[PDB]
Design a binder for this molecule. Structure first.
Ligand SMILES: C[C@H]1O[C@H](O[C@H]2[C@H](O)[C@@H](O)[C@@H](O[C@H]3[C@H](O)[C@@H](O)[C@@H](O)O[C@@H]3CO)O[C@@H]2CO)[C@H](O)[C@@H](O)[C@@H]1N[C@H]1C=C(CO)[C@@H](O)[C@H](O)[C@H]1O
Ligand SMILES: C[C@H]1O[C@H](O[C@H]2[C@H](O)[C@@H](O)[C@@H](O[C@H]3[C@H](O)[C@@H](O)[C@@H](O)O[C@@H]3CO)O[C@@H]2CO)[C@H](O)[C@@H](O)[C@@H]1N[C@H]1C=C(CO)[C@@H](O)[C@H](O)[C@H]1O
Ligand SMILES: *Cc1c(COP(=O)(O)O)cnc(C)c1O
Ligand SMILES: *Cc1c(COP(=O)(O)O)cnc(C)c1O
Ligand SMILES: OC[C@H]1O[C@H](O)[C@H](O)[C@@H](O)[C@@H]1O
Ligand SMILES: OC[C@H]1O[C@H](O)[C@H](O)[C@@H](O)[C@@H]1O
Lengths: 843, 843
């Protein structure tokens, strides 16, 4: 397969699967054609993988998530096929430039943050390692939002990634499943339950092939798009004039796939958010059930189901899988409860990504009882069993103990106990065993996940322990063997090899192969070359060359002009008080103030030149987070155009941060910040990406930083701030008026309140770092406390950067210490210790 | 190009431009693949035709219509490419059957009745004869409606023809034009008018290639699909919960293409109906303007516009082209009024399809003034000129004369006259020259078409004369050279060659070539063979063989079982009191009654066995038309299951009549009915289709029947009923109580009122044939008057059918007399006498 033939197939797709006029000439047009030419390879390989999986009928794993941050497919598809050189030349022939063409591809708006990017990285590694595994998701039209930066801060625009269609998917019109909303349950002649009536939609399959690296294995991401058949369009309504009414039925179905994480401060938003989940679970399980059946054929035994199927619920969003699977087995296939439940408990597993026990999904029983009444019946039964198992394992004898065990583990909170358990609380019945209308009737989804899965895991050593000790303690006591750890990882193909080709050449030279891309353990061979002068020279050149593409990005996106000969200091993550963008910007503001009260000779002596880059999206409704992006932009306007500063310091907020932005930013980064309040982050995947590219980390002892620090070495990581255990106490200390801040912290607050950063003044923002008690005040995320520790830790970063021998030594040790954080070994662990699947290699 | 290669390309499209799972196996799946394989040929040819038209820059013709009844594309594409034999074999290889595959294609819901089917036939003939010509239309999603027959009569279901996408179109993403609604006009610095504000949508192009027969020429049907850019989606509205509000902007744009002829008894339906038209006109003219400019390049002279462009407004729906063209020339290109108007008058032309002067499109000025204010300004100016030209040509001297000329020709009725004309009516001003609020302010679109076009034509000799004498008399007096005739035609490739292959073989044998398909004049060589016994034998066999496919259709669609050894008597057209389905069914009911009051020996002696087939759609809101389909179905239920009748008589209502149904029905038809009240039909295209297939016509002296009768011979056409001139008098005779019906007509009415046809009784329906005066009563369409003439004319049809020598003799003379009714010569006439275009043959 040479470049001359690819050039023909690109031309062919431009003209014979066309989207534009023939005489029209666009980089974009070249993209859709090039996309389709690569896609031909994925189809061949996808069909081969599909067909051979059916033959072998091995256990298949299924990863359900509400997010898939897929990113641009072109550069990684071509890379994994190893046609990256020849496609480039094929495009020269046609008067195009691969890099330039690739940058016309829009980012699929199928995800948002870590949850989704993990999932996507997991799909790459599953394919690359020949594991039989699909992802199931939903096909979002507008996604979360396209972020634009005005002079008012952030604004939100709905995404346009499907406007011309997605070349990377295949519609499967034969694959349509019915999904039902509302309705009621009745008991038919045959003793069996039947869910009738309500509202009915159809989920249709849109497949996105996932090609593996140096393998024919091409796995799949099956994406549901909701609709209703044209016949549900009401002509009477339309011809009468009421055009919205005529379209109402279609809107109801279609809106399930409109927006990611739709705002739920309205009963109609909660119902939609809930329909999104049930749709994903139901459609996906119906499809999985169908595959099991067609493969098993005549010799069909449902006891084989969990040895042929593994479902993985990513976070609590897919919880409904549990009762839904029970629904189909009993109501549709005619299994008994115990036979169905045994299969369910062994099929399903749960991964938790939160460290806080009050960030776990809860739903009003009333809302759920209305929308999915059959599922509540089933949940009710599950909760009754759960409680009879707690009864067996503890009490009658000690009741107040039993009382505590039952609160912790119940799925339905503030509900009348079943007559069985209720007995044990008579005096008549204790207040505890009755519904109290003063509070809502709530369904706790995390608890239902733990009850329903055979395995529960966290995403970092520290976090998986918090999960056992704080979050699900009484459950761990009951079922200790459930609980596991699976530290996250990221694919080295997207996050080193293809986003950082310059570094990748350097790596393969000195290690003596490019095999590290696949077997990333062989990066450790770099430890010994850390001090070698020549390596250091190539390594600094590369970093510098990668920074020049960011100069183009900043120039292009913001308008600001920045020099690549500064430290590229990057904080890039969702805007939140707890992630503490505010801590970083206030630290920059401190250095700015010092520069201004210092002679132009001394400014150079005291501070290394920096380009401090922020990025990320603020939840639209989050007032304070949006004020924070506003504030940062204002600092940039003031700092960047100040004659006294020049190129000594620039502050930039890159808009619309996404996979494509990260791909340019990350390889160019020298310092990255991961400074969340200690014990608030569960893992963090960007941490791992940065280190792989030789970027140094400044951060707290929190999440993935803790293990990253172990692997790369404590000497090569800038640590600061309060540790997780110290936190609760520092806050209680604050509440009783005992916290007195550093004078330098009050200095900055007053210097911000001075009005130096525009007409905004921000007395309100600084007000969130003051007082001793109250929502949104009282410095809950310890910005003032960690401040002195932090700015002093930044002085150590300056002083290390002064010795580019030391800096680059540490840079190389970070790449050399990254092997542990490859999603490849994360997948192995999942495959071996949870799903119990094996790889399937086609001959 | 042999069948072995086509079989590969079909397989290729199934697997490499897929719509289904790979293991899935469907006739439907085979269709989408086969469609795409043929399409490869159309693309090649379309691009060649497109490119060569640009080189030659000849005058191009443009046919605007709100309807295109395209029909299934597969059988006609393959036919026109002459790959019809090899595609059939290519499909045998893959385990499929072309006929069976073809029948999986859905009918595009892009039209409805004659207006649209004419347009489509016109596009075939334009391509076949190498004329440079496009069609411009709109891309309807749900169309008019899918008709289903229940036991309640007709019901309407929205169509599903786009549910899996149209394989026969190409989206042209670079071709998008902005269209504006509401807004206001202001005069900018540069003396020029500027239309600002309002609502803005975009029309995107979806091209449908039109391949010609035995030519590479592939012309185009450009179809506009309305939308707005994703950014107009309101996330704030969506996240707040108001999901319809968030989607409102998209609904407004998208609904313009939802339904054909949306119900307009509501101000919101009228506004939509009006937006549909403006969108079609604006988008299309902007595109035409763009093509003229790019071709002309540097040497650009707008005086050349009408020698390089011809627009044809089909009916009054595209009238807005006139002021829209004026808008762009003056406001956008900077032409003066006279320079713009001269170009407009010579570019545009109008075809009229109505015989009634009160069936001509009128719009409220207020509604138009709100939606398109700039166009009303322009119309106002046009009407003022028009009136100053009437002033020149008539009056001041005779004023009451002038008064009459001004009523007849005004575009804006019930509006204050311009100060110029108003002068002439002082006493102060005459009531006539003032707005009278007692009546609406109306814009008469037909008059604006006549003022704005260089040519005005009817669609039949008789009708084109009515147009000159009754409808536009004062205009004919003023501009006699405007007025023309262009008798309709239908393509012989779709309506003989491809729908009736059995007859087509017979034709080519005896004429000694298949060249008649193209040069249809050579059907006249059949006159001499009309009596030859052998021809007659093959000819009757064919007709009989074609009737057996209708037996399958009836069995399949209705459930009824019918014998092909009866007379296939077909009335197939839109359900309307004026088309008089009621006259036909009451005539059948008369024969049924006679059969029942007659011995089983005599039933055979008196009547020939028949299968009487009805078809067509009733306007949903038309109460009486819907009662008529109901009544017919009830007669069928009673007649078809009556032991006394057996196979002597069957009545069938075939549901969902469309192009595909006509293609099976027409070639099987022996008698077809065209019995509209005399002088109510302008032409009729199905008339011409039937005769071409050797079907005999029973009809009134009305529309296309008059010329069909001339061509095939009066001896070979069953004529009955009152002539057009007699009508007005018969109605006035009715109003003054002088009409006394035939006793046999009162007999049937009472026999229907008897309750013999179910629990419905229909006293209401028969009530519409009674009284002397009043809306919906008084037998306005002369059913009772023409009845005796009609049933006696059916006795003559029976007696002719008895002698199958005579019947088949006349059948052959009908085919032999059809040459005049080929759309080919219709097109030549349009090309030569109106558009002034020439054919363009690529070397
Ligand atoms: C989810 C939420 O977490 C954080 O909220 C915490 C408050 O900051 C604390 O003050 C504390 O609340 C305590 C009361 O102040 C105290 O008087 C007593 O009644 O106990 C309360 C215990 O809750 O604890 C809160 C939660 O643990 C954080 O401040 C806040 O930003 C977080 N919510 C944001 C997230 C979203 C969604 O992305 C937005 O919708 C919210 O508006 C944001 O505020
Ligand atoms: C368009 C309409 O045409 C026909 O209507 C005619 C009436 O049948 C006549 O009675 C006559 O109306 C006259 C009054 O009865 C008389 O008292 C005097 O005031 O003069 C009147 C003059 O109009 O003339 C009418 C029009 O020339 C026909 O009966 C009717 O079916 C036709 N409309 C149908 C079409 C559609 C759209 O497809 C439906 O919306 C209507 O409901 C149908 O009725
Ligand atoms: C990797 C990645 C993230 C996750 O970063 P965290 O440190 O987990 O916040 C978010 N967004 C994008 C675009 C990414 O590539
Ligand atoms: C030709 C045709 C018509 C037009 O028939 P009229 O005699 O003009 O009513 C209507 N519908 C279909 C499907 C046709 O093919
Ligand atoms: O922000 C911390 C992130 O850590 C990891 O990426 C988790 O997988 C994700 O759920 C979480 O959001
Ligand atoms: O029904 C009579 C028909 O005659 C012809 O087909 C005309 O083109 C069409 O406008 C009209 O509807």
């Amino acid at each position: 397969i040479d470049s001359s033939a690819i050039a023909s197939n690109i031309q062919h797709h431009a003209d014979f699967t066309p989207l534009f006029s023939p005489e029209h000439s666009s980089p974009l047009k070249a993209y859709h054609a090039t996309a389709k030419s690569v896609f031909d390879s994925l189809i061949m390989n996808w069909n081969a993988t599909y067909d051979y999986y059916n033959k072998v009928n091995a256990k298949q794993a299924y990863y359900l998530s509400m997010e898939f941050l897929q990113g641009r497919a072109l550069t990684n598809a071509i890379g994994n096929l190893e046609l990256t050189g020849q496609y480039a030349e094929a495009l020269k022939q046609l008067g195009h430039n691969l890099e330039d063409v690739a940058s016309q591809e829009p980012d699929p708006a199928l995800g948002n943050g870590g949850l989704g990017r993990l999932a996507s990285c997991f799909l790459d590694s599953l394919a690359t390692l020949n594991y039989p595994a699909w992802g199931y998701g939903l096909r979002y039209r507008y996604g979360l939002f396209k972020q634009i930066i005005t002079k008012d801060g952030q604004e939100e625009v709905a995404e346009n990634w499907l406007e011309m269609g997605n070349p990377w998917e295949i519609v499967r019109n034969d694959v349509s499943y019915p999904v039902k909303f509302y309705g009621k349950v009745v008991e038919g002649t045959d003793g069996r339950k039947h869910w009738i009536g309500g509202e009915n939609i159809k989920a249709v399959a849109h497949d996105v092939p996932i090609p593996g690296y140096k393998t024919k294995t091409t796995n799949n991401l099956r994406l549901w798009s909701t609709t209703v058949p044209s016949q549900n369009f009401d002509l009477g309504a339309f011809n009468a004039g009421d055009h919205a009414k005529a379209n109402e039925a279609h809107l109801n179905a279609e809106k399930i796939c409109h927006v990611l994480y739709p705002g739920d401060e309205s009963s109609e938003g909660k119902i939609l958010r809930l329909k999104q989940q049930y749709t994903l679970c139901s459609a996906s399980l119906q499809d999985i059930i169908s595959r099991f059946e067609s493969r098993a054929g005549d010799s069909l035994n449902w006891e084989d189901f969990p040895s042929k199927v593994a479902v993985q619920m990513n976070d609590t969003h897919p919880t409904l899988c549990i009762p839904e699977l029970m629904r189909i087995l009993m109501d549709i296939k005619g299994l008994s409860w115990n036979e169905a439940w045994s299969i369910t408990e062994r099929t399903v597993a749960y991964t938790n990504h939160t460290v806080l026990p009050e960030a776990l999904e809860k739903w009003s029983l009333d809302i759920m009882q209305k929308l999915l009444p059959r599922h509540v019946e089933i949940i009710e039964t599950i909760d009754e069993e759960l409680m009879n198992n707690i009864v067996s394992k503890y009490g009658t004898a000690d009741i107040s103990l039993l009382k505590q065990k039952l609160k912790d583990m119940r799925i339905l909170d503030n509900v009348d106990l079943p007559a069985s358990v209720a007995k044990l609380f008579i005096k008549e019945l204790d207040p505890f065993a009755k519904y109290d209308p003063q509070f809502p009737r709530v369904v706790r989804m995390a608890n239902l996940c733990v009850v329903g899965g055979h395995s529960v895991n966290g995403v970092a050593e520290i976090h998986s322990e918090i999960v056992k000790q704080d979050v699900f303690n009484s459950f761990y006591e009951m079922w200790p063997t459930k609980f596991q750890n699976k530290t996250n990882g990221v694919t080295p193909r997207r996050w080193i090899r293809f986003c950082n080709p310059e570094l990748s050449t350097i790596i393969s030279k000195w290690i003596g192969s490019d095999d590290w891309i696949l077997n990333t353990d062989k990066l450790a061979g770099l430890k010994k070359f850390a001090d070698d002068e020549d390596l250091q020279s190539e390594w600094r050149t590369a970093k510098r060359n990668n920074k020049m593409k960011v100069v183009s990005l900043i120039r292009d996106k913001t308008g600001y002009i920045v020099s690549p000969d500064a430290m590229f200091d990057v904080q890039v993550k969702r805007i939140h008080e707890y992630k503490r963008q505010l801590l970083n910007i206030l630290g920059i503001v401190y250095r700015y103030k010092k520069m201004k009260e210092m002679s132009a000779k001394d400014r150079r002596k005291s501070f290394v030149p920096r380009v401090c880059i922020f990025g990320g999206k603020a939840f639209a409704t989050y007032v304070q987070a949006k004020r924070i992006v506003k504030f940062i932009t204002d600092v940039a306007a003031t700092v960047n155009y100040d004659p006294d500063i020049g190129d000594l310091l620039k502050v930039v907020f890159v808009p619309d941060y996404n996979v494509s932005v990260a791909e340019t930013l990350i390889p160019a980064s020298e310092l990255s910040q991961h400074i969340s309040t200690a014990g608030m982050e569960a893992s963090g995947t960007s941490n791992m990406k940065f280190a792989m590219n030789g970027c140094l980390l400044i951060g707290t002892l929190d999440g993935a930083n803790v293990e990253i620090r172990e692997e790369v070495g404590e000497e090569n990581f800038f640590l600061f701030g309060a540790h997780a255990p110290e936190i609760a106490g520092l806050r209680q200390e604050r509440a009783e008026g005992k916290f007195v801040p550093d004078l330098r912290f009050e200095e900055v607050k007053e210097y911000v309140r001075s009005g130096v950063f525009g007409t905004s003044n921000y007395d309100e923002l600084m007000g969130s770092l003051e007082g001793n008690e109250g929502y949104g005040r009282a410095d809950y995320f310890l910005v003032g406390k960690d401040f002195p520790s932090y700015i002093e830790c930044q002085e150590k970063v300056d002083e290390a950067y002064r010795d580019q021998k030391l800096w680059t030594r540490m840079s190389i040790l970070n790449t050399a210490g990254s092997p542990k954080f490859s999603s490849d070994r994360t997948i192995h662990e999942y495959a071996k210790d949870i799903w119990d699947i094996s790889p399937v290699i086609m001959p």
